[PDB]
Amino acid sequence: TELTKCKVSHAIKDIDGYQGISLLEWACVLFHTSGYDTQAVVNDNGSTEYGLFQISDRFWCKSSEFPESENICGISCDKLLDDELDDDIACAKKILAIKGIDYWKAYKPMCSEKLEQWRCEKP
Amino acid sequence: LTACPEESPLLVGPMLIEFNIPVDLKLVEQQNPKVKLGGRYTPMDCISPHKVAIIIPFRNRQEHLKYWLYYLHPILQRQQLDYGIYVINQAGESMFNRAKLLNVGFKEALKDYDYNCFVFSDVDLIPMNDHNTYRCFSQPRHISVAMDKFGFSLPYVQYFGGVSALSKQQFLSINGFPNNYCGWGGEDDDIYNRLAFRGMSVSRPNAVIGKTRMIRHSRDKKNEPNPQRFDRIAHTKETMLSDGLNSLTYMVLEVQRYPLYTKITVDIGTCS
Ligand SMILES: O=c1ccn([C@@H]2O[C@H](COP(=O)(O)OP(=O)(O)O)[C@@H](O)[C@H]2O)c(=O)[nH]1
Ligand SMILES: OC[C@H]1O[C@@H](O)[C@H](O)[C@@H](O)[C@@H]1O
Ligand SMILES: [Ca+2]
Ligand SMILES: [Mn+2]
């Protein structure tokens, strides 16, 4: 499902400030990463990235195409293509704690300025 | 004759835009008798200072093109523009390269006429209010500001995709567009970066006048999201000096002059 900025913001509220990344920055990051589409599936080539957060089967989730994956998040990648974001967020938090924000390549180029546009005033 | 007025007296404002009824180009020609071979139109009423070349990046979207021609020809004549339509068709089956085809449009249209404005438009976007003039302004213009696909709101302030317009001098100033973005995404953000580096800002109509519809479609095969797009847009400042109009190479396989448009098929290779 293609969610809106505010729907995403409310859903991921519990991630605001973690590892120093704000909700405005995340709103910006996820739009450029998946267009806020919870069913987004993108080939990176050799690897595949899934859902809102575009979590890769290379190291983070286990897919059918790559079963021998490290599966650091301990979850099937199919659980990352639905509208229940709790498990997606738990995995993103592991990536942030281990690798950091640089996993999300859109951060530096698209979310280093003009962050106020990403605010959701709908509480 | 004298100069066309500042705002055209023929404008109707808001329009119902729908894609349910089949389109017959023969009917479209019939309804637009004033359009000459090659899809060229010039007011016989007054002299327009806007000599506009409209460039459309293309590959396997013929059904979309039909609706585009059906709706835009009448609109543009109403806006009293001295224009020409150019469809730049990518030959082959390699990754689609939108930005490079737009560069081809700029160079090939200049061979036909002394154009001073270039409107770059995707094939699937139709404006919903004819007050959203398809011409150039004193600063680079972003035209499709409120797409129904984004809830009639701009997705982000730095967005320059869909439909935009650059005067000839604005285009020359940024060394045109990038040639090395293959697959979906990022090339419009790179163009936005180039304009900012040259000290320009983006001009836009308000969201009511800029309302636009995009024909519903799934992603095209061979235009999958580009993995290197984020690394590329992060280095625009250095690549814009050597990648653009000054490094553009391509091969023309065919030039077609139909009554409603000119279609140029080209081989633009692959990304470096
Ligand atoms: O196979 C393709 C891919 C792209 N395009 C052109 O490239 C533009 C960018 O298109 P796309 O609609 O895929 O992306 P969007 O604007 O919807 O993100 C299109 O509208 C077309 O004018 C095309 O003609 N054929
Ligand atoms: O679809 C809207 C925009 O989304 C951005 O994330 C992409 O980088 C642009 O190329 C695209 O035009
Ligand atoms: Ca989930
Ligand atoms: Mn489209």
B154 in Cβ contact with B103 (< 8 Å): no
* Terminal C-alpha separation, chain A: 21
Flag whether A79 is marked binding.
yes
Q: Residues enclosing ligand 2, CB less than 6 A? A: A 32; B 155, 161, 185-186, 188-189
β strands within chain A, DSSP E: 41-43, 48-50, 55-56
B179: left (phi over 0), alpha (psi -120 to 50) or beta: alpha
Give distance in angstroms: CA of B244 to centre of ligand 2.
Answer: 20
B62-85 as b/e: b if 16+ CB within 10 A: eebbbbbbbbbbbbbbebbbbbbb
- Report domain A1-123's class: mainly alpha
CB atoms near residue B237 (< 10 Å): 11
- Ordered DSSP codes for B25-80: HHHHHHH-TTPBTTTEE--SSSB-S-EEEEEEEESS-HHHHHHHHHHHHHHHHHTT
SS3 B83: strand
**Rg from Cα positions in chain B:** 18
Residues 150-189 of B with CB under 8 A from A: 151, 155-158, 189
Cα(A21)–Cα(A108) distance, rounded to whole angstroms?
A: 12
- Ordered DSSP codes for B43-56: -SSSB-S-EEEEEE
Cα(B8)–Cα(B43) distance, rounded to whole angstroms?
A: 11
**Rg from Cα positions in chain A:** 14
Domains of chain B: 1-272 (3.90.550.10)
Cα(B121)–Cα(B98) distance, rounded to whole angstroms?
A: 11
* Experimental technique used to determine this entry: X-ray
- In this structure, the strands spanning B51-58 and B82-90 are parallel
Q: Which of B82, B108, B130, B188 is catalytic?
A: B188
β strands within B106-201, DSSP E: 117-121, 125-127, 141-142, 146-147, 163-167
